[PDB]
Each structure stands twice: as structure tokens, then as C-alpha cells.
Design a protein around this nucleic acid. Sequence first.
DNA 1: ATCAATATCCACCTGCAGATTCTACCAAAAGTGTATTTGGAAACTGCTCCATCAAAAGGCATGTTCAGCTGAACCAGCTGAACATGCCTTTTGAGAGCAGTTTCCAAATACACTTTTGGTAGAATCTGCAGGTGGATATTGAT
Length: 86
Amino acid sequence: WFLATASVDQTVKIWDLRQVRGKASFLYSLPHRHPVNAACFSPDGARLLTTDQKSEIRVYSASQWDCPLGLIPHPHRHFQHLTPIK
DNA sequence: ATCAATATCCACCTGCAGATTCTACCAAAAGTGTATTTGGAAACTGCTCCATCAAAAGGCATGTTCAGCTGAACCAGCTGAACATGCCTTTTGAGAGCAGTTTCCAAATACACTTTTGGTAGAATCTGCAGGTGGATATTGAT
């Protein structure tokens, strides 16, 4: 009963699907400098991976979603006819 | 020169990718009226410019002379055009950044009046430099 979603708005949002109903009465919001191509949870559940379109990877933790633990810089640049990277 | 090869010129046909033409509108042209300038008629002065003279002097016209240069012939060689080819580099087609508008305002900046005020015209002094004077070198060419 917590959810993750990613968007071209340069933000990635963590929801609580049972509690929220109010059109962005969300739980947490993490910003970025560029768009996001993927936001995938762990198997254990405590580590969120996030992957942008220009050059970055971020790891956010269970503990205080806002601040990141670590950045893994690596270029996976976006392109029209290319399949986006995950 | 003659004949083969072969690119270029030139007739004839079709369709579609760009040319041309219709239509409803909004930024732009134009007519009034006023105010607000501004540049040409009129009238004058004074610096600088146009036609003359006179005593040199330094530059131009003309005339000799010869060292050194500009094509013309010719050619060893090099080096860069013409073709086979295969092979590999260049064309074509299947979402988010950013140029281009729009609001609208905190900040920037023209403009009326005065108050200074450094810059400029013009008189009154400096002195480094155009000349000169002379001696010692440094190129140059003959031999």
C-alpha cells in the first residue's frame, strides 16, 4: 500500500493508494533536474531506484525519501526512435 | 582523312509537388486638426583664397653607356589524369527541447529647471629640434 510513479514533470511521486483521494494530496515528492524514465522498487522494499534521461541515477531510501543516499552517474541519453532505458 | 563507340541534343507523355488563385479578417494607410518645430530669404563681416612678381636652386629633359635581365628552344623525368572494381560509406523512413508569443511589473531612464563648473579662446612665455659644422667610420667596387 505504497506506490511509486514517475513523470516528465521532472518529479517522481510516492503515493499511499488507500489514503489519498484529493488530486495531489500525495505522500511524498522527490524532484529532479531532468525527466525520469524509470522508478523501480527493490525486492526488499526499502531501496528505490530512479533513472533519468540525461545523465544520472539516484537511490532513495525508506528512511526520509527526500534526500538521496547516492548518485550513480552514467549516460543513457534519450532519443526519439530509441527505446527508453530502464 | 574515314568509320565505330558513345555521350549529348532533342521529340513525345504523365502526374504531382510546388504555383496560383479565392475568402474572412486585423494591423496598417490615410485624412483632420493642431501644435511644434525647422531651414531658407535678408543682411554683414573677416579669414582665407586667386592672379602677380622677383631672386635662386634644385629638379626635369635629353643623351651616352654598358651589366645584367626576359623570353625562346629543348628536354629528363615526374607526376598527375583515365579506368576496372569491389567495397564500403552515405541516403531514406519508422517524443521533449526550445524558438516563438504573451502579462505585466520593479527597475531603468528621458526631460524641465538651476547650479555649478572644467573646457576652450586667446595672450604670453619655454625649449627640443631643423639646421649647421666637422670628424670619424662603413659600405662598395677595382684590382
